[PDB]
Amino acid sequence: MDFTDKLIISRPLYISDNADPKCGYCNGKKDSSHKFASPGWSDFYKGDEDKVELQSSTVGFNSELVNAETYDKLCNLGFRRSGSFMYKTDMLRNCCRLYTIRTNEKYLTMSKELKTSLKRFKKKITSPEFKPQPKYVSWIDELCDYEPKSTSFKAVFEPAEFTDEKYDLYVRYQHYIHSDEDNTPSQFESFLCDTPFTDSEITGTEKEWEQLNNWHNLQPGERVTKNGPAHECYYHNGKLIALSVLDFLPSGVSSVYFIWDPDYYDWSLGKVSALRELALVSKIGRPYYYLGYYIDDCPKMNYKAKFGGEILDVCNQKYVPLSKIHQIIKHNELFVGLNSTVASPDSEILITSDKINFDEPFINAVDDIYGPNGNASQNAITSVAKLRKYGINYSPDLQRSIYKEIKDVYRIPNVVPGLVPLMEIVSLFESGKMNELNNNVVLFDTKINALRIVRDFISEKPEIKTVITDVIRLIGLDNTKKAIIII
Numbered sequence: 001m002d003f004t005d006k007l008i009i010s011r012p013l014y015i016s017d018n019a020d021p022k023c024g025y026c027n028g029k030k031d032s033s034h035k036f037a038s039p040g041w042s043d044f045y046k047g048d049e050d051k052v053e054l055q056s057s058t059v060g061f062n063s064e065l066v067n068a069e070t071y072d073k074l075c076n077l078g079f080r081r082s083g084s085f086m087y088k089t090d091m092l093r094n095c096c097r098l099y100t101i102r103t104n105e106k107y108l109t110m111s112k113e114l115k116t117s118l119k120r121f122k123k124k125i126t127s128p129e130f131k132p133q134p135k136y137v138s139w140i141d142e143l144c145d146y147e148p149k150s151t152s153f154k155a156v157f158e159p160a161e162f163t164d165e166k167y168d169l170y171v172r173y174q175h176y177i178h179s180d181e182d183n184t185p186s187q188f189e190s191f192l193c194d195t196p197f198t199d200s201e202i203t204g205t206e207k208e209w210e211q212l213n214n215w216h217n218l219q220p221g222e223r224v225t226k227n228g229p230a231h232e233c234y235y236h237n238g239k240l241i242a243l244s245v246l247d248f249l250p251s252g253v254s255s256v257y258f259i260w261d262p263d264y265y266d267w268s269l270g271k272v273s274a275l276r277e278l279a280l281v282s283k284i285g286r287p288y289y290y291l292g293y294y295i296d297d298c299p300k301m302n303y304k305a306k307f308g309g310e311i312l313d314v315c316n317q318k319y320v321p322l323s324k325i326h327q328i329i330k331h332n333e334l335f336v337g338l339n340s341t342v343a344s345p346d347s348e349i350l351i352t353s354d355k356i357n358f359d360e361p362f363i364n365a366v367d368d369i370y371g372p373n374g375n376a377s378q379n380a381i382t383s384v385a386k387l388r389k390y391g392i393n394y395s396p397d398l399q400r401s402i403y404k405e406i407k408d409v410y411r412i413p414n415v416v417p418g419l420v421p422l423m424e425i426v427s428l429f430e431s432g433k434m435n436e437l438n439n440n441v442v443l444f445d446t447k448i449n450a451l452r453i454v455r456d457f458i459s460e461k462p463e464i465k466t467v468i469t470d471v472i473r474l475i476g477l478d479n480t481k482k483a484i485i486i487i
């Protein structure tokens, strides 16, 4: 068994509680105009907005082992890792609308602000002896010329490993952004070190890191072999002044976190590091730079739009340029795309089985599907009843409203945007496609205390079949065929 090709995960969890105080983006505080997922839900509560208590809710699973290609797939399904825990919000029920965003130098429109940050950076690290090139095609070539020649500033990629020096910088940065507690060594280790990736992706080789540390001099068409997690340490005269935590993916680079020395506030290291990482993505010849989640009404997350790009529509599993939809998500709405030329949807969009083209006209179909008189809930309730014959232990969500009006952690709601709809899970069973799990999916069976390959899925116990089906809802059938699920 080739553990380098496996996604080893624990059973999924759905965790929900009051957004005041669980949500650190909004603290549970919204105007009525930003409170609900769609106009139809706003209308449902018109004049009664005060009776809803906003919840913050996530779904996900802990990973023991994941490779970079698989984490790339997870990012492009809307997940992010928090240490080893792969999670996403419930976009229908969450207080805040979180969208996965990605960009690149093509989408980037260098603003006066951003140009100033690089101009000041060049000055801080460059000697007057520095002799500029006669011309530069682009800011990237300029950066790649002067930065490696600096004698006072050096950046170094290395394995994503704990050191006391990195931890002390983290506590100083966190105190400064007002996390004066909840910063133990163990919390820093879990969050930014001790990753779930393969040994080769963590440690690499001396030559692989050397190659990555000369990325400034890569020529068009060359690549780097690095995949997996990394730390980029910034040194000013040998002192650690910033730390970027980055995941290298086949499709690009994901920013996990960035910390810097509060004494260096005048260096605008948040903007400079983002630009350096956009240059890096371009130089290593990969297509995307992933800044995590975008929230339109949160300043601490909507700054990511300064770097341009596109937003994931998790219901269609396709990205739409942010410029095309910003106007209709600026009141915290859920967007579900539907091309203007296609019939009104009597159902959640099919994810396992045509595909939306955002370059043709489209509307937001959110209320047709997920609104108070949308079809999703009734389709899901019927599907729960159909899944009983297969030994799937789901329960119908019979409440009129998706919102809490004035807890089993293994129970996922019937309807969650971007999870495989229950109606489609039914189709997988009826067509025989669930039997494709046989000889593929593996369990770490905690009662036996051993790995075993599933050989007859439909004969497994209901508790096991229900867990496997929820993993399929989260990551899809094909990805579950390479999973090891701990049960």
Ligand SMILES: [Zn+2]
Residues within 6 Å of the ligand: 019, 023, 024, 025, 026, 027, 028, 056, 094, 095, 096
């Ligand atoms: Zn919130």
